[PDB]
């Protein structure tokens, strides 16, 4: 097979992804 199974079955949040994308965007905004 199917390969796109529906994500988001819960409400908890992962901070690793948000932090790393925030850093990767701030560095571009300053560069």
């Amino acid at each position: 097979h199917v390969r796109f199974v529906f994500p988001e079955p819960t409400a908890d949040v992962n901070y690793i992804v948000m932090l790393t994308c925030a850093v990767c965007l701030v560095t571009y905004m300053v560069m």
Partner: protein
């Protein structure tokens, strides 16, 4: 002409003030305080010192239920109604609900699966129980969906709870409700899987035509403990009873006409004249004002147009009147209207330039805003740097730094001098006093004075330019 827009703005301000005076009626604060003190401050029984505000366990909840709650709800005068202060009529019957989670919705480590036989997760929609339990006969032991119950989410303190669960509608008499809650307590209703409990009811008070909707919530976190919270909201659903109500309706119509005039005046100008239009800061204030006003008008129209819950309750009065959505939208409307009033009053600065002193001060503020922003960036960076340190170091022991926004609020309260050192000091013998003293010194001795330096420099420069241009030409 300036005079025309000035006079129309004053008329708009007058009608706004009339609306605010009308909505903020005679002392509803005393209504709310009497209800709050009756249900939140009385001890659960004649021999304990615990009230609803200081619940600490699940047995205290049962003591409160078959106890102070029934004492406050039912007042003695064929199945006669109940007047709470001999004035407030209890509408229909109260309702009690719980939200639960599922056993086995957790992950026990394999090396501990011999002295731990059950783990219940924290509350979440994808983990709530939906199966019958106990003496599965009535509605208190059978799951009911959110659509069959006419519910909605709540946003409590720990999580946001759905509008489903296991519910009971209580009775109109003390004896029957006492029997029902005794039966609920006997066949255990609240167990380790319980996550939240709600109690809901309403009163009328015909003296001043004003309903009151009462909701009491108790949250049971997965880590143990009890967290209580409450909500008393007054409403007006039968508006047109007196002449003052008709006057208020006329004023509301006038407000709608004024908003239409302002938006059409805005669109007549934005069309071709000055396509940029955004380098003024007064146009931004005007557009935000009209956006807030139209949002408030839309909310009011959507909220007062349907009162079908009240009409359905008036058919038979032995049922539960569901007024939660009306209270929610009343709170939303109040917030929107308060912010709109604040901004309308701020907009008055556009017209106070009648002499050479008002213009001087306005020019000073306008020329100072840019570098005030420039330094406020640094000020906020340092503020948040202190806040995150406080959150990480004291956030697990002090209850004043338990959440990040609470850290921000505590740091703002420290500036006013409203600090309690008796708990922060022993949270960390080192790095506790250091944080406090460095924060105080670098906030009052350094960062408060750079604002002064900047403002003082720009004001002096403005005066020097205005006095050198003048008397020399």
């Amino acid at each position: 002409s300036v005079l025309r827009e000035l006079v129309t703005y004053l008329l708009f301000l007058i009608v706004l003030c009339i609306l605010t005076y009308g909505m903020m009626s005679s002392n509803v604060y005393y209504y709310t305080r009497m209800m709050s003190q009756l249900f939140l401050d009385t001890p659960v029984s004649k021999t304990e010192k615990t009230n609803f505000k200081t619940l600490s366990s699940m047995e205290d909840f049962w003591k409160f239920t078959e106890g102070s709650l029934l004492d406050g709800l039912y007042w003695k005068m064929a199945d006669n109604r109940s007047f709470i202060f001999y004035e407030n009529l209890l509408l229909g019957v109260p309702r009690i609900r719980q939200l639960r989670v599922r056993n086995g919705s957790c992950s026990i480590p394999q090396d501990l699966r011999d002295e731990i036989k059950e783990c219940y997760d924290v509350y979440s929609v994808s983990s709530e129980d939906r199966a019958p339990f106990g003496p599965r006969n009535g509605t208190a032991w059978i799951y009911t969906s959110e659509k069959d119950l006419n519910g909605s989410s709540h946003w409590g303190i720990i999580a946001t709870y759905s509008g489903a669960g296991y519910y009971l509608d209580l009775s109109r008499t003390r004896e029957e409700t006492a029997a029902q809650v005794a039966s609920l307590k006997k066949n255990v209703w609240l167990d380790r899987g319980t996550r939240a409990t709600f109690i809901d009811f309403s009163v009328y008070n015909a003296n001043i035509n004003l309903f009151c909707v009462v909701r009491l919530l108790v949250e049971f976190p997965a880590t143990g403990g009890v967290i209580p919270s409450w909500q008393f909201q007054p409403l007006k659903l039968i508006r047109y009873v007196t002449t003052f109500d008709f006057f208020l309706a006329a004023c509301e119509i006038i407000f709608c006409f004024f908003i239409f005039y302002y938006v059409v005046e805005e669109i007549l100008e934005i069309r071709i004249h000055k396509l940029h239009y955004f380098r003024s800061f007064w146009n931004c204030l005007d557009v935000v004002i009209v956006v807030l006003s139209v949002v408030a008008i839309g909310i009011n129209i959507y909220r007062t147009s349907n009162v079908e819950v009240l009409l359905q309750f008036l058919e038979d009065q032995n049922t539960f009147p569901n007024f939660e959505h009306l209270a929610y939208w009343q709170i939303q409307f109040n917030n929107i209207a308060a912010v709109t009033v604040f901004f309308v009053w701020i907009k008055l600065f556009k017209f106070i330039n009648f002499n050479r002193t008002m213009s001087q001060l306005s020019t000073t503020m306008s020329r100072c805003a840019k570098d005030l922003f420039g330094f406020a960036i640094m000020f906020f960076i340092i503020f948040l740097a202190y806040a995150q340190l406080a959150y990480l170091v004291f956030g697990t022991q002090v209850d004043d730094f338990s959440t990040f926004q609470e850290c921000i609020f505590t740091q703002f309260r420290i500036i006013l001098g409203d600090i309690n050192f008796a708990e922060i000091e022993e949270a960390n013998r080192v790095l506790g006093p250091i944080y406090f003293t460095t924060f105080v010194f670098f906030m009052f001795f350094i960062l408060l004075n750079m604002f002064l330096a900047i403002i003082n420099d720009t004001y002096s420069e403005v005066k020097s330019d205005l006095a050198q241009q003048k008397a020399e030409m």
